[PDB]
Each structure stands twice: as C-alpha cells, then as structure tokens.
C-alpha cells in the first residue's frame, strides 16, 4: 500500500526482520507473494510446504516465486492442513515475519471451508451443511431460490444451475466441497480395474497423486504435468485408484485413441470393458463402464443421431465416479464447459500440460473443476532427467529491404503473410535444417500460415502436413519420418500442436507463429521434451528454435509468447547471426528470387 | 593511471616533484618489473655508462620488456645519456630513501563516500557542502546552470556513478588535481602528499577536501596529526540475477538500491532484500541518460552474490546478450554531421577532391559508384576554399 520514491512498495514499517534471517530462507510479501531460495539447505522442505499452500508463478534456478490465493488455501485445507498447521510453520520459516494482512487472509480462507458441501446422490445434487446458519444466511439473494429445483441440513439443487451457484459461492466466501468418498460408496458398484505392476510411477507423479488423494476421499482438481511426463499414466493411475466408473474426455480422435491405448497398456481392465463413444467408430458404449469420448460430441448442440442420443441419455442417467478431462485449458469454452453440467460426476479430475491462455477464463477453471492440485517443476524434471533438456533459442532474422518497405507501407494485415515469408528467415531455416540434417537430428518444422508452409515445403521438397491432408497420407508421412533414414524432417501445420503421438525429435524449428499464444508455444515445445533412452540433462541434446523477424510485429508476439516458458525457467538465447550462413549456399541468394517471392506474396491477396 | 599522470609532465616540474621524503619511492614502486633492478644498480655510480651495455644487458628473449622499461624511464627522465647516469638529485634522494638521511577509519571512509554518492544522485537527504558541490560541478560530472535549484547530473555523471569504488575515487582525485592547477593550487605540493600517504594554506585546504572525501580523519578537532583511512593509501557481492530479468539484491544501504533503480524497475523492498526487474524501459532509460551496457554488466558482475559465482559465466548469457542488444538498438541509427556534394561534371576532379579530403582527414564517407561524398562542416570551409582556389 505504501509506495517508495521508486515503483517498489515500501514495507520498512510494515513487518519486522527476524534476527536469524540467514537461517530463515523464506520471504512473505503483504500481497501474498513469496520468494524462496533455491540455495538454502532446507530448500526441499520449503519447496514442499510452499507448493502445498501456494501455486508457482515463476520458478527460476535461484529464487523461486510463489503466490497464494483462496483456491490454494482451500486445496491445503483439503489435503488437511489447518490454519495453524500452515501459519505456524509459515512464521517459523519466514525470515521477516508474517504481515497481519496475510495472517487474517489465511485465517478467513481456512475457516471459510467445509461449511458447505455438495454431494450428488441418485442423480440429485444436495447442498449439505452440518452448520445450519450457513444456509440460513446464504438464502438472502433470490438467485438461490430461483436456482433451487421447484443437523446436516441439505437441499436439492437444479442440475443446470450448478456452475452458476458454484461461481456465486466462490465470491460468497463459502467454497463447496467436491470430495468423493469412493471408499465408502455402495450406490455405484466398484469397477474391475487394477494397476498392473508393469506400470512405473515416477516420484513427481506419485507426489501429484498423493496431493490429489490427500485423504481417503479423492479430491477434484487440476494437475498440470508436461506432456512427455506421463500425464496419461497419471490419469490412468487416478482412475485405477478410484476403482469406479470413469469417463475420460479427450479433445480429438487422436486423443481418444491414445487414451484407449494407455488404458489397455497400463491397466489390467479387459478390452471389452473399454468403449470409444466416437462418431467414426463405437464399441457399444452402453455395454461397458469405462468410457472415452470427446467434448465436441458430449456438448454437441445440433441434431443428435438416434444411437448417439440413446448413448447420451444413458450417460446423463448414470453417475460417474471419476470424470477425467484432458487438455483442461479448453474447458472454459462455451460448448466444452456445457459438458460439465451435461454429465454428472463426483470428482472431475483435470490433466494438461499448458494451463495458460490470454482471455481471463483460466481462473474459471478453479471452480469449474477445482483448485490446481499439482504443477510439476519443469526445471527439476530436467535435472532429474525425466524430461530432455532443451536449448531454447530465438533466431533473429533481419528483414529484407523491399519486404520491410511493403510491410511498413501497408497498414493492412497482409503483414502476417509477409513477414512470415521473407528471404532472410527462409535462408536461416534452410541453413539450420541443413546443419541438423548433417547432424542426424530429427526436425519438426512449424508454421501457422498454410500458404507459407506450402511455399517453404515445395521449395525444400519436404513432406508438409496440414489440416485437410488425407489421414492415410498423414500416417504414411509420419511413418517415413520415424523409420526411413533418408528423411529426417516433417513440416507440420497448426494441426501438429492440437494433439498427436509423434516420435521424439532432436530439434524443433518454428518459422512462423500463430500469435501471442502461450498455449501454442508450450504445446509445440512439449514435442521435443520426450526423454531419450540414454541422454543426459547437460548435453542439451534437444533444441528449440523460434525464428523471428527483426523490427516486426513478430518480435512483439514472440516476446509475449515466451512468457510461460521463461516463468518455468527456460532461458531463450537470442541469435543475431548464424556462423557459416555466408559460406553455405542457400536459396534467395539474388535480388531476383526475392522479387518473385514478393510478387507472389502480393498476388496472394 | 598514475603512470599516465606522471608521464604527462615536464622535466622542470618532474625534478622538483622528486622530493626527498617519498616521491623517489612512490615512483619507484611504479616501475613494473625490471627498471627497479636497473635503478638499484646505478644508484651508486657517479660515472655514466654507454647505452650499448644497457641494450645488451637483457637476453634476446623478452627484450620487449627492456625497450618498454627504457622508454618509460626515459619519459620519467630518471637518467640522462650525457654522451646513462641517473639524475644527481634523484640519486641523492633515493639514497636518502635507502639507508640514508583502523576498523572505525574504514567505516568512516565508507560512510563519507556513501553520503557523497547520495548527494551525487538525486537524494533528498544528503550532506551539504557548497565547496564540494561546486568542485563536483567543475569536475565535469555535474552541471547546475541555476544556483537556486540543486544541480542535476550530466551524462558522464551516471557513468562515473556506476564505476567501482577504487576506479571511481582514483578518477575523482585525478580530476581534483587537474582542477587544482586551474584554481591555482600548486600541483607538486598536493601530489607529494598522496605519495607520502601510502607509506601551508594550500596544504590545509587540500587536507580539508580529502577529509570531506573521507580519505583522512584528524579525529582531534582538526589537529596537525591525521590518521589516513584505507582509501587514502590508494568485498562480497549481494545481487542475484535470474534468467527472467529479475534481480534480488541483499541491500540495506539506500545507495545500492538507487544504483540498481538507475537501470531497473523496482518491485518490492524487503528489510534485507529488494526485488527489481531489468526491462526495456529501464535499460533504455539508462542508455539515453548516457550509460552503456558495459558499465551495467560490469556493475552486476562485481556485485554478484556468492550463490551465482559457482556457475560459469557468473552472469547469465541471456541477460548479458539482452542488455547488449537493447543498447545496440538505440544506436541503430548513427547520426554524423556532414555536407553532401552533387553534380560532378568529371570524375577526375571528384577523385582529386577525394584525395585532398583523405589527406586532410575531412572526408567521412565516399561513394565512387554514385560519384559523391560527405564532409563534416569543419572541413566544409577547407573544401570550399580549395574549390574557390581551383
């Protein structure tokens, strides 16, 4: 609240300093921001405690940055950490005390939890509460009465208005409890699903699963893990532990196929007990319990084919022990979020690898599913070797003079097609691909503009893939990339970042970017995180190049796009010039070729 | 350096400056490697010796040391060819110099220099001294232009501020001597005191200025005896740099926070720590003020916390490269005053004018293909006179 002569807020008169400040490695700002030391001997204990009570926002190598909020404190209470149980240790760890503001915030957030519980039974959602005064003073606003369908006091609530009531309670200061007591539940018989000994659970996976199962009752929340870290395995383990009917929701055909494959590989459950509620193919969804389907189908708003209507009615009628949702970052979308209310589930677990978006709808996930239970430390995984180390780099390509002339002259938005296609970046990508090809490194080129992708691919006679590409040709190209030594590069379009199971690649060049999309950046980066059989963290075998054009809007987009990665800790090294480019022969070495490319770009319209 | 300062002097001032007590020893210590040995050798000789002996008195290997030492001491005029006997005065003084004839102080020096830097920066609370203010103003690192309003800080001021304490103080004292000659204070008398430290009205005023700078402290209500501080004769880091342009500095003295804020955006200030961000805005603000990326990088490196000393390099490459690129972008457009030519009837005349401009140094850039060139306004008069002369 107090501002120094500079921008930083003043806290000299706010909180004191502990005498043994050197011993205490923890800081506590009044706003809730906490700065932990990664060099302290008790760093591991401090990390565990701060991860338990707070969500990371920036975890560089030296000083980690966390911030706590109501959702994080509710998650702490869910895993069973009381207000004293957290605040006493927070004061002990803190080297400068705990401000009264944070003290009262923690007390209020902890006490305002568990008073209101939401439990669905016999397809009816009852708002139970041991304390009756909570309901007595909660029925002040008319929205509760209109929403409601027309000790231990409970009342039934309308299915459709659950989301509205939950978001209302969040700001009403009485969070709802979504814990599932699968251990004590006889209404829905347990499913015959077990985890085979073959599956191996990594320490971070086990920690995330523990945070989810803080107690005997499973907690509904979101666990963010890298795509290469085995989030599919974590979800399968969660379903197996729940031992009740599980509905996994993918985002595409590839996602559902991969989910079925993961289920069969890691769970002893028989093949016949798994169904694919997919329009392309179905396996008698009503027949078995464990189901894999898609948001588009479940939230489909237009006409429903009679068979799918029967399946949808069956799904609505039945109650699901677990609702796994992969790629939760798309949930807050209108149709996708409608699925949450369409289907009934005790706990709706969420898994993803890029929980970031521009529109401020990510906060809605906290109530749509639950608090962010776990968020894996990418740097720690890199050190442990579970994830391939990546030498993140941004190659600056100076824009050609004529191209810059037209780009600046035109105030329209042909610049997206223009600066994405310039001779300098073309030569840079050509030279980089040549260097990695002679180095036997697998290349996955990326480009949002299909026009630019096709032009580059024809000029380099490479197998570009994109949306309306035939599925058979897509599979053939991927198989050739994985097996044929003569080819070691594939030019994938935006479809690549959506969802795929692609072979591990040693480099990932991105000539063009869709825009300031942290989601796309992280999605494309996750491709090369696949750990090799015998690599090492320090070898930096994996490389990521984000080619950008100097003095162009692409620079702003790249800087706005690398925020999530830098927050994780990746250091994007800038490359102004590439050694050997002048000696190496490359296309567009003369003014004329740039002229024809510019003419084609202009005629593109 | 002191070697530069002494080299930039005349023989008449040099021999006088070679006072008996200390100068002959302070200048001796300057002798880097070998000239010490020759000075000791021909300290006891009253007969000059041929130059060929000195030439051949060093082996073939490492002769460049011989030539450089001989040139340096010829510039110092310790001896004369006399045809290489040393100066009689220097010989006598050196023979007389060779068998012939605190914890609170360092803190005081630190505090005094810190308050001086606080005044140098726009600190509302700082020590007030009109003589110090005017001395800094005339030192070339500050300009007021309005006695009523407090003086501001010039471009050189920020560069001086970001320098390390040793070099900062040394340059400050160099400027002090140069301005002492201008104000009329005898240079030799004040200079000899500095040499004597490492072992009149003008003397009293000079000692007062030194005490104001914090190098000395009488401690006895300005008595004749003085106890020089450590700085008179001539530390761990605290900043931690992340990979996201974030600085965590364990600073309690406001001077360090101000120095960091000069080129970073401050976010939080804890009792024993402060958080700042190195953004384009702050870095380009410093560059426009006059700093260059080299000073910022050196400052962060010297004030480097021990935690980041283990990693090599100490400062992350991404941070260093980003700072350098930010400074470069500002000077992408290089402005240079000049005068253009047009309508060259014949290329022979243009080439002759180009040769003349190259000889005189007037030319700044030329274009043979377009038959044109650019000349600075200073050389515009010369080239115009040449054209008039035809």
């Amino acid at each position: 609240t107090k501002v120094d002569e500079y921008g930083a807020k003043d806290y000299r008169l706010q909180m004191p300093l502990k005498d043994d400040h050197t011993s205490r490695p923890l800081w506590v700002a009044p706003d809730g921001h906490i700065f932990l030391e990664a060099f302290s001997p008790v760093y591991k204990y401090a990390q565990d405690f701060l991860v338990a009570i707070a969500e990371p926002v920036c975890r560089p190598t030296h000083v980690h940055e966390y911030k706590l909020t109501a959702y994080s404190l509710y998650a702490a209470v869910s895993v069973g950490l009381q207000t004293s149980d957290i605040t006493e240790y927070l004061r002990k760890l803190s080297k400068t005390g705990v401000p009264d503001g944070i003290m009262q915030f923690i007390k209020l957030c902890t006490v305002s939890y568990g008073k209101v519980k939401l439990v669905l039974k016999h397809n009816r959602y009852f708002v139970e509460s041991c304390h009756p005064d909570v309901i007595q003073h909660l029925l002040q606003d008319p929205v509760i009465r209109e929403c409601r369908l027309r000790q231990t006091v409970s009342f039934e609530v309308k299915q459709e208005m659950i989301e509205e009531l939950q978001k209302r309670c969040i700001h009403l200061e009485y969070p709802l409890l979504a814990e599932y007591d699968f251990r004590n539940d006889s209404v829905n018989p347990d499913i015959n699903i077990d985890l085979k000994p073959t599956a191996v659970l990594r320490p971070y996976q086990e920690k995330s699963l523990r945070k989810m199962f803080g107690n005997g009752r499973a907690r509904s929340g979101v666990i963010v893990l890298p795509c290469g870290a085995g989030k599919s395995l974590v979800g399968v383990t969660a379903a197996c532990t729940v031992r009740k009917r599980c509905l996994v929701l993918g985002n595409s055909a590839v996602s559902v196929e991969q989910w079925k494959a993961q289920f069969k590989m890691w769970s002893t459950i028989d093949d016949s007990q798994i169904c694919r509620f997919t329009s392309d193919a179905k396996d008698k969804p009503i027949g078995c319990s464990v189901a894999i389907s898609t948001y588009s189908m479940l939230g489909h708003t237009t006409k429903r084919s009679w068979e799918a209507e029967r399946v949808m009615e069956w799904l609505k009628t039945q109650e699901w022990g677990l609702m796994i949702l992969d790629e939760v970052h798309t949930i807050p979308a209108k149709m996708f979020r409608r699925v949450l209310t369409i289907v009934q589930a005790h706990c709706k677990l969420g898994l993803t690898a890029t929980l970031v978006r521009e529109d401020d709808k990510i906060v809605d996930l906290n109530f749509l599913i639950g608090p962010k239970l776990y968020e894996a430390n990418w740097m720690e995984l890199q050190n442990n070797g579970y994830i391939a180390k990546v030498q993140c780099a941004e190659v600056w390509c100076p824009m050609s003079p004529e191209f810059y002339r037209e780009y600046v002259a035109i105030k329209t938005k042909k610049r997206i097609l223009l600066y994405t296609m310039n001779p300098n970046k073309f030569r840079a990508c050509q030279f980089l691909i040549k260097f990695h090809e002679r180095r036997n490194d697998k290349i996955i080129v990326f480009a949002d503009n299909v026009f630019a992708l096709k032009e580059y691919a024809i000029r380099l006679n490479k197998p570009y893939i994109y949306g309306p590409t035939s599925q058979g040709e897509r599979m053939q190209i991927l198989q050739n990339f994985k097996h044929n030594p003569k080819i070691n590069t594939i030019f994938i379009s935006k479809v690549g970042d959506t969802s795929f199971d692609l072979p591990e690649a040693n480099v990932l060049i991105q000539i063009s970017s869709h825009g300031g999309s942290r989601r796309q950046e992280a999605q494309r980066l996750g491709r090369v995180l696949r750990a090799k059989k015998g690599m090492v963290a320090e070898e930096y075998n994996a490389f990521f190049y984000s080619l950008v054009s100097q003095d162009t809007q692409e620079m702003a987009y790249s800087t706005k796009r690398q925020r999530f990665l830098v927050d994780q800790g990746y250091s994007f090294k800038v490359i102004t010039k590439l050694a050997g480019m002048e000696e190496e022969d490359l296309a567009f070495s003369t003014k004329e070729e740039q002229q024809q490319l510019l003419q084609k770009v202009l005629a593109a319209t | 350096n002191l070697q530069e300062f002494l080299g930039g002097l005349s023989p008449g001032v040099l021999d006088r400056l070679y006072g008996h007590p200390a100068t002959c020893l302070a200048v001796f210590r300057e002798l880097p490697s070998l000239a010490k040995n020759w000075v000791m050798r021909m300290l006891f000789l009253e007969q000059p010796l041929p130059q060929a002996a000195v030439a051949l008195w060093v082996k073939k290997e490492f002769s460049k040391a011989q030539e450089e030492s001989t040139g340096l001491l010829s510039g110092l005029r310790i001896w004369h060819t006399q045809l290489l006997i040393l100066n009689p005065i220097f010989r006598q003084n050196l023979r007389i110099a060779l068998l012939g004839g605190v914890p609170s102080l360092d803190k005081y020096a630190e505090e005094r220099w810190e308050v001086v830097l606080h005044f140098m920066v726009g600190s509302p609370s700082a020590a007030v001294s009109q003589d110090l203010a005017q001395l800094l103003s005339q030192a070339g690192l500050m300009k007021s232009t309005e006695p009523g309003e407090p003086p501001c800080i010039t471009s050189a001021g920020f560069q001086f501020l970001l320098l390390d304490t040793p070099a900062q103080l040394w340059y400050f004292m160099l400027q002090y001597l140069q301005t002492a000659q201008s104000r009329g204070m005898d240079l030799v008398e004040i200079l000899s005191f500095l040499f004597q430290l490492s072992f009149s009205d003008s003397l009293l005023n000079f000692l007062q200025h030194l005490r104001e700078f914090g190098l000395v402290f009488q401690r006895k209500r300005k008595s004749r005896r003085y106890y020089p501080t450590r700085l008179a004769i001539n530390q761990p880091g605290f900043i931690v740099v992340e990979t996201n342009y974030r600085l965590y500095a364990y600073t309690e003295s406001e001077l360090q926070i101000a120095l960091i804020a000069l080129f970073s955006e401050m976010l939080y200030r804890f009792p024993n720590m402060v958080v700042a961000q190195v953004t384009r805005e702050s870095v380009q603000q410093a560059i426009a003020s006059g700093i260059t990326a080299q000073q910022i990088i050196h400052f962060l490196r010297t004030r480097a916390h021990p935690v980041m000393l283990k990693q090599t390099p100490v400062l992350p490459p991404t941070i260093t490269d980003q700072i350098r690129l930010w400074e470069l972008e500002r000077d992408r457009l290089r402005f240079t005053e000049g005068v253009l030519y047009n309508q060259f009837l014949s290329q022979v005349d243009f080439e002759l004018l180009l040769a003349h401009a190259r000889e005189l140094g007037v030319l700044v850039f030329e274009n043979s293909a377009k038959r044109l060139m650019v000349v600075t306004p200073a050389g515009h008069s010369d080239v115009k006179r040449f054209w008039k002369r035809q």
């Binding site: 930096y540 090294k573 800038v574 490359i575 102004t576 590439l578 050694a579 | 990326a293 470069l328």
Partner: peptide, 15 residues
C-alpha cells in the same frame, strides 16, 4: 562428437 553448435555454445551478439 555430438557437440553443440557454435551459435548456441557462445553468444552471437556483437559484444
């Protein structure tokens, strides 16, 4: 063998 490229091993900025 399998050594990192020059432009990633060392800064390519002119400084």
């Amino acid at each position: 063998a399998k050594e990192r490229p020059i432009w990633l091993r060392e800064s390519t900025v002119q400084g």
